[PDB]
């Protein structure tokens with residue numbers, strides 16, 4: 311069997327076993343706490359329904375209002391600042407879902423917006439990421455020549471790259487634990503889930519004390535952090551991961567080259 | 570100025586102007602509806618508070634319970650089926666957020682899981698995506714030779730783009746049936762899923778305890794998300810990927826001449 315076919319089959323077997331191992335661990339960590347929390351909330355729901363004389367239909371009518379008011383609770387999510395924050399989440403594939411298009415026209419424009427946006431943003435981060443690596447490689451070469459030597463190795467680049475990722479999450483967690491009044495660990499977890507473009511939406515910045523409309527300085531920092539932070543991670547994947555994606559094309563070209 | 574520096578600066582100017590234009594359009598389409606909906610719901614909130622004799626504190630007390638019960642309402646999200654669905658959302662960067670780790674140990678394992686997972690998934694989709702393109706290129710060459718021969722880039726972009734619409738439409742038809750959504754809603758869900766945006770406003774396997782009671786539909790939803798991402802992955806491998814390595818190609822050419 312060809313090297314390309316062995317490599318692809320190995321990756322499929324790897325991903326599926328990684329999913330089974332992952333599902334096994336998340337079950338061990340989250341199954342029991344979820345059952346405990348569900349049982350606990352089922353009691354509070356019955357106690358509050360009894361306290362304020364609420365029927366099955368009465369609670370259900372009140373349930374619809376509370377859920378529909380959730381995106382409005384944070385404040386105005388769709389003026390210029392909120393629409394820009396949303397535009398960021400779309401093209402960067404973060405998609406928190408804290409604010410999603412409620413109109414059919416909004417949903418349609420979002421699809422066309424993402425179709426051209428996501429490739430543009432992806433290419434931009436890989437291009438700027440490469441320029442950052444080229445600058446770091448030049449700075450390190452000049453420093454080595456300065457102290458007394460001079461060639462910049464791949465290992466030196468992986469070290470600077472990995473430290474840049476740690477520092478970015480630490481700087482972010484320092485700021486988001488301050489402004490969003492979270493613990494350093496929570497703010498760090500938010501920064502990790504944001505900059506990996508997972509964006510669960512369990513933690514979202516600019517959703518407290520009408521920040522999008524009343525705190526422009528914090529909003530400016532938040533946009534600059536998300537964009538610069540994604541460039542730092544983007545530069546690191548351009549350095550380590552990207553080379554493995556062109557591997558099948560390199561081996562296929564080599565096959566035609568020999569034959 | 571070097572080609573690399575002109576290209577990078579052009580892309581930065583492009584992205585920022587695309588963000589300003591985007592923010593301008595979403596404001597025009599969503600600002601007024603949001604103000605109208607906020608005002609409508611605030612009337613219903615006052616009417617329901619009056620109907621069931623509820624105070625400011627009384628409503629707030631029930632508000633906390635309704636919001637906290639939302640992830641539990643869909644059913645058990647953390648057994649083997651729910652943890653596998655969540656494991657998919659993490660490594661594929663979809664991250665609906667319908668179920669997120671509530672424990673410190675869950676949050677920590679999730680971070681290490683993503684750190685190694687996301688690059689493994691990305692490499693896998695680009696590798697399988699390339700193999701699919703190579704097969705399509707072979708099938709088209711054999712067909713051209715058969716009917717009465719070289720496969721162009723333009724022919725590949727056409728088959729690739731049509732495969733993308735076919736995967737969104739097959740998905741939309743299937744999800745609009747099992748989730749009782751409109752074709753447009755199911756299509757929008759398939760688009761937001763396969764682009765890894767994953768807002769979470771529409772999430773499959775969240776009705777009638779599907780994760781625990783409907784294994785056949787759960788099996789289809791796992792297979793669709795994974796195959797669908799391979800179809801989009803193959804298109805980026807063909808069209809987008811070449812432009813990401815362009816800076817490195819130009820930098821190598823600079824050292825080659827000088």
Ligand SMILES: CC(C)CCC[C@@H](C)[C@H]1CC[C@H]2[C@@H]3CC=C4C[C@@H](OC(=O)CCC(=O)O)CC[C@]4(C)[C@H]3CC[C@]12C
Nearest residue numbers: 313316317320321324547550551554684685688689692
């Ligand atoms: C902190 C983060 C950014 C680290 C990312 C780590 C990656 C560089 C790793 C994670 C999974 C790895 C892959 C896991 C499995 C394989 C199959 C493996 O296939 C074989 O050994 C058979 C074919 C052959 O001989 O090449 C080749 C390497 C590869 C693609 C690995 C390449 C390196 C990957 C992408």
Ligand SMILES: CC(C)CCC[C@@H](C)[C@H]1CC[C@H]2[C@@H]3CC=C4C[C@@H](OC(=O)CCC(=O)O)CC[C@]4(C)[C@H]3CC[C@]12C
Nearest residue numbers: 389390391392394522523526529530531533534537538
């Ligand atoms: C090298 C790079 C990182 C610099 C990029 C330029 C930044 C300085 C720009 C890009 C986006 C800008 C933000 C885009 C949107 C807004 C919302 C804006 O708020 C309003 O207009 C309030 C009223 C409304 O919400 O309609 C205040 C400025 C701010 C934070 C901007 C501040 C300046 C930012 C961060």
Ligand SMILES: CC(C)CCC[C@@H](C)[C@H]1CC[C@H]2[C@@H]3CC=C4C[C@@H](OC(=O)CCC(=O)O)CC[C@]4(C)[C@H]3CC[C@]12C
Nearest residue numbers: 425426429430433572575576579580583804808809812
């Ligand atoms: C349906 C989807 C998957 C389609 C994806 C379309 C992409 C192939 C497009 C979208 C934005 C485009 C980019 C927008 C801007 C530029 C800057 C442009 O820069 C210059 O013209 C100056 C430097 C030079 O001469 O190369 C080079 C092409 C590039 C990277 C474009 C390459 C092709 C991109 C990535």
Ligand SMILES: CC(C)CCC[C@@H](C)[C@H]1CC[C@H]2[C@@H]3CC=C4C[C@@H](OC(=O)CCC(=O)O)CC[C@]4(C)[C@H]3CC[C@]12C
Nearest residue numbers: 326648649650651653780781784785787788789791792
């Ligand atoms: C190469 C590709 C096209 C095929 C990959 C193999 C599939 C046939 C596998 C991969 C993941 C599997 C699923 C992983 C998890 C589950 C949950 C499982 O449900 C339970 O175990 C119920 C109890 C619980 O949740 O603890 C039922 C089978 C199912 C849908 C599996 C069905 C078979 C699937 C889709």
Ligand SMILES: O=C(c1ccccc1F)N1CCN(Cc2c(-c3ccc(Br)cc3)nc3ccccn23)CC1
Nearest residue numbers: 402403428435506507543544661690691763764801
């Ligand atoms: O934003 C980043 C990024 C993240 C970290 C650091 C810097 C970055 F730039 N992305 C973009 C989103 N994602 C690419 C991606 C797509 C995919 C892309 C475009 C389209 Br269109 C459709 C689908 N599918 C999958 C499936 C599994 C894993 C990854 N997948 C990771 C890199």
Ligand SMILES: [K+]
Nearest residue numbers: 403507662765
């Ligand atoms: K994503």
Ligand SMILES: [K+]
Nearest residue numbers: 406510665768
């Ligand atoms: K989300």
Ligand SMILES: [K+]
Nearest residue numbers: 404508663766
């Ligand atoms: K996402």
Ligand SMILES: [K+]
Nearest residue numbers: 405509664767
């Ligand atoms: K998401």
